[PDB]
Design a protein around this ligand. Structure first.
Ligand SMILES: Nc1ncnc2c1ncn2[C@@H]1O[C@H](COP(=O)(O)OP(=O)(O)OP(=O)(O)O)[C@@H](O)[C@H]1O
Ligand SMILES: [Ca+2]
Ligand SMILES: [Ca+2]
Ligand SMILES: [Mg+2]
Lengths: 362, 152
């Protein structure tokens, strides 16, 4: 009996089998329907996006379209992994500070619709910490939907210090779409959002000094890059390369009053007992696709140093495979019989209902 | 945000501790652990916690990950036991081994009622406390194979 590990990101499904070193199915968490007013899921919807309007059932880490989310799960099991879910204990994931009903409904659907024999819902950042070989550290987990700050000491996340910012990759993509209009480009539709997402992933970077970089961009074309659109047109982008992810450090770029990711990290550490802060500062673990911008670790190191006491030893850990750290941590933990001992069985669900998830999954 | 209506409302509770203590009862490696002063060592082998024979304690394969439980008498009472738990990560250990060692360190901590103080010991970065447990510290070439199946 092999457990399935499914990390339902806001933007990407990562799914596979416990004990594998990587997810075997990675595909967009999207359902597409005809743009002219019956549905396609995942890679095929992305392929046929020329004639489809694309919708994400997860927004900011919360499932907001349950009918479409069921399509995503059905596709993951039957079309991608090609498994019968009733034969496989299933590990799902979730970001912290989600409303309780999100995991209640995940649990209900897994048992009542997919008939899984057992399941567990794990906190994403905790999986990433274990994937890094640590029991103590502070994880900055940023995917398509949410940026979370999760401090963990001796294997226990510290709930009073967990912080959440509903600003992540999708907001960055949308902002790149907007600023690209300054150059006279028009990216508006859901299909165009996916093109700009690709531009963002390929060409964006975090500047070490934002104002200096803006000056460099105006002095010459040395920072410019070209990109070929699917229709063949070649566009040029310049300071948008770094203005886009600057939003993580200056959320006011998209009109949010929130502190930037460096300040939230600092604030989360400061909510922890003083005696453990040095260990957290020396163990900032980056996780998620939105932490993949070139330059982000160096910028974090600079900004946290400016906020922290002058002698504080600060280290940013940026695992090269951090797009998959959550999944990998799940694959490891789901390979351990003692971890599986805590999973909800189908009988337990039959007798206790969705409320049992809160009493078994931590 | 409101912790109370959220999926972390039960973190930090007696309930969380109870569930995790129960889970730790299902690992044979912990039975009889920490019963007298000394050092006990396990190596991760394809996700399993495998005892290291006492005659090898202090020798560690650079390709592997280990858990080292140091049981001692605290200053407060010479007839009671306290614990440092170190997890040692070889320079060439694979991700599955280090991650299992971390998770299982927390589990041993749970099994021992939270009393162990945890220490992450990367090869070449071992703490003063770790160095004090053992020319008894010897690093060996090689190690056991990863538990991961490689996806091509
Ligand atoms: N190299 C890259 N540079 C910048 N952004 C990237 C890069 N690679 C991926 N991303 C972005 O990361 C996001 C997807 O990453 P990931 O799979 O970790 O997120 P997720 O699990 O779907 O989201 P969440 O966990 O927040 O619900 C997208 O916004 C994507 O464009
Ligand atoms: Ca090994
Ligand atoms: Ca402890
Ligand atoms: Mg994610």
């Amino acid at each position: 009996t092999t457990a399935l590990v499914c990390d339902n990101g806001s933007g990407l499904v990562k799914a596979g089998f416990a004990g594998d070193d990587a997810p075997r199915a990675v595909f967009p968490s999207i359902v597409g329907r005809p743009r002219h007013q019956d549905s396609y899921v995942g890679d095929e919807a992305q392929s046929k996006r020329g004639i489809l309007t694309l919708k994400y059932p997860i927004e900011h880490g919360i499932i907001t379209n349950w009918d479409d989310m069921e399509k995503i799960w059905h596709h993951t099991f039957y079309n991608e992994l090609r498994v019968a879910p009733e034969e496989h204990p299933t590990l799902l994931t979730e970001g912290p500070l989600n409303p309780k009903a999100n995991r209640e409904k995940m649990t209900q659907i897994m048992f009542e619709t997919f008939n899984v024999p057992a399941m567990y819902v794990a906190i994403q950042a905790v999986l990433s910490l274990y994937a890094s070989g640590r029991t103590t550290g502070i994880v900055l987990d940023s995917g398509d939907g949410v940026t979370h700050n999760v401090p963990i000491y001796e294997g226990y996340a510290l709930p009073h210090a967990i912080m959440r910012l509903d600003l992540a990759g999708r907001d960055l993509t949308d902002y790149l779409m907007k600023i690209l209009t300054e150059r006279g480009y028009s990216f508006v539709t859901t299909a165009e959002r996916e093109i700009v997402r690709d531009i963002k992933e390929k060409l964006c970077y975090v500047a070490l000094d934002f104002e200096n970089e803006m000056a460099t961009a105006a002095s010459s074309s040395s920072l410019e890059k070209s990109y070929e659109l699917p229709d063949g047109q070649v566009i040029t982008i310049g300071n948008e390369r770094f203005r886009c992810p600057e939003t993580l450090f200056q959320p006011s770029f998209i009109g949010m009053e929130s502190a930037g990711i460096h300040e939230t990290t600092y604030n989360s550490i400061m909510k922890c007992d003083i005696d453990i802060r040095k260990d957290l500062y020396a163990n900032n673990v980056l996780s998620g696709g939105t932490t993949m911008y070139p330059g982000i670790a160096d910028r974090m190191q600079k900004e946290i140093t400016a906020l922290a006491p002058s002698t504080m030893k600060i280290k940013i850990i940026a695992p090269p495979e951090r797009k998959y750290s959550v999944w990998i941590g799940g694959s490891i933990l789901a390979s351990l019989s003692t971890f599986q001992q805590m999973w909800i069985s189908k009988q337990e669900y039959d007798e206790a209902g969705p409320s049992i998830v809160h009493r078994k999954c931590f | 945000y409101n912790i109370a209506d959220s999926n972390i409302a039960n973190l930090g509770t007696e309930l969380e501790k109870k569930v995790k203590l129960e889970a730790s009862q299902h690992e044979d490696a912990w039975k009889g652990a920490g019963k007298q002063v000394g050092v006990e060592i396990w190596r991760i082998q394809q996700f399993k916690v495998v005892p290291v024979p006492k005659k090898h304690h202090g020798s560690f394969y650079t390709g592997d990950s280990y858990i080292v439980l140091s049981t001692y008498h605290p200053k407060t009472n010479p007839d009671k036991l306290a614990y440092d738990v170190h997890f040692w990560l070889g320079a060439f250990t694979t991700q599955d081994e280090a991650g299992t060692a971390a998770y299982k360190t927390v589990e041993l901590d749970d099994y021992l009622g939270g009393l162990p103080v945890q220490y992450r010991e990367v090869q070449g970065y071992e703490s003063e406390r770790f160095l004090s447990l053992f020319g008894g510290l010897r690093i060996l070439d090689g190690g056991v194979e990863t538990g991961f199946h490689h996806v091509e």
